[PDB]
Amino acid sequence: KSVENQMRYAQTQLDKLVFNATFHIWHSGQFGTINNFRLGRLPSVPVEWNEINAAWGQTVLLLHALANKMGLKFQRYRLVPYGNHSYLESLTDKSKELPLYCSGGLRFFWDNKFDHAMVAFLDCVQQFKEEVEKGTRFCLPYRMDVEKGKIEDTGGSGGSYSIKTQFNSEEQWTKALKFMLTNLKWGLAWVSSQF
Template identity: 25%
Template sequence: MDDRTLDCEVDLQLERTAAHSRRTSVAEPRAAIAGSDRFQDDLATCSDEESLRRKLVSVRRRRLHCHRLLEQAEAQQNALDEQLLAVIRQRDETVLDYRSVRIAIATQQRQLQISRQWNVTNDTFHIWHSGPFVTINGLRLGAEAPSMEVGSSADTDRQPNGPIEQPRRYLGFGAQPAPSTVNPSSNSNEVRNQEGKNTIRIHWTEINSALGQVCLLLSTLEQKQCCGIRYRHEIVAQGSTSKIGIRSINNQHTAYYNLYSDDSFQLFGKRNFNTALQALVQCVVDAADAVQARDPTITLPHALEKTNTRSGDYVVGGLSVAYGTDGVEWTRAMKYLLTDIKQLMMFKPFGLRHARS
């Protein structure tokens, strides 16, 4: 190979090297620029992932918080449901109690309307009659009366050979016959008078017991505060041995007289007994004045008046209340007296009928 050929190859090689250098110098900046873009993309991608991770963590936290809030809300709802059920049960119980109270009130009002028709005093001290004799709680008050045939109009309450029947009152309503503890064979004597007629005489034990019941009745009426009854004399109710304390005019002294007697001989007769009996009638007059002052419609069927004599004895229905020789008249007088007392017991405050509407 000659030098010219060698020079051509060297020049060609140099040209090739220069071309390669030029190509290399142009390609390297392009490659560097492409690598930088990929790095920026990678950085952007990494930044998005971190942001997403942070968002994911935040979302998870929020979801956990929402779950907790939901659990709390469910717990509160359950508590409110229980409270609602408790309130409903309490309301139902209250409604039932209210209805039961209304029913009880209606029942008590009906019972009150019935009880207003009662007269306790009249039921406790039952004044009735047994033939010609007046009775109080089955005890006859009177001295004597002519005996009548069984079945007659004046002795319809007496059985032929048995105890006296007295009507039994139930709370002031109706009457049913019930045998009394008084037996004619033991507490009264049936004798013949001068005209040859049979006469029934009452023993003093029964008379004294009946007068004791009258004293207890009048004392009970005085104790009722709504009536304003005040007696001039003092009543000492002691059953068959009751007494009347007669007060002096200035109320400084009180003399007690026995409102009971017997068949024994007494020098001055029944003077002390009659004095006590007159004082008892005075107490009845005081009660009548107090009752009529409050209720003028109540009037006594048999007037109680004083005689114009020196003794000033009381008469009822024109008959003397003093015990004397005429037992039949005294029996009628006692019947009139207890009839007046029974009329006084019709005064409303003596029973339960004065209750408020």
């Protein structure tokens, strides 16, 4: 099973079918893309952070719209769509900063706020998964592990890939993000079909 095939499968459903904006999830080599922004970077393709931040912003807007369409209010966090500087807020810790954007440079010179934000977002994606799967044999294709901040290539390599940048490689981080976008694409197909 290839992630590209999983995306095609979802695109087949989507083509046979309404939202305020359009959210087109696809692939470009090793990258997952959303509305043409690459969500990742590679040693050989140093995607600018403005583009990564924009991809995050569209991803947040998508999950926000999916949750609003379903009547789902997330636990633990709320999404704050804010263009290319989108973020979450913790519902229990008003202090906590959870930016889904970063500026350039080296992981070394950063705190963990962006990484915490991405794990909080994966928590929300997993909550969405539980709602679409409730009751149907339907399942989003890639298992998510919120405790560890990882996504599994279920039925592919079987490996688990971190959504955090710290202690990770750019190629594995990009893979995790691409599996996450595939899950959201499947979610959009299911939501567009069942609502």
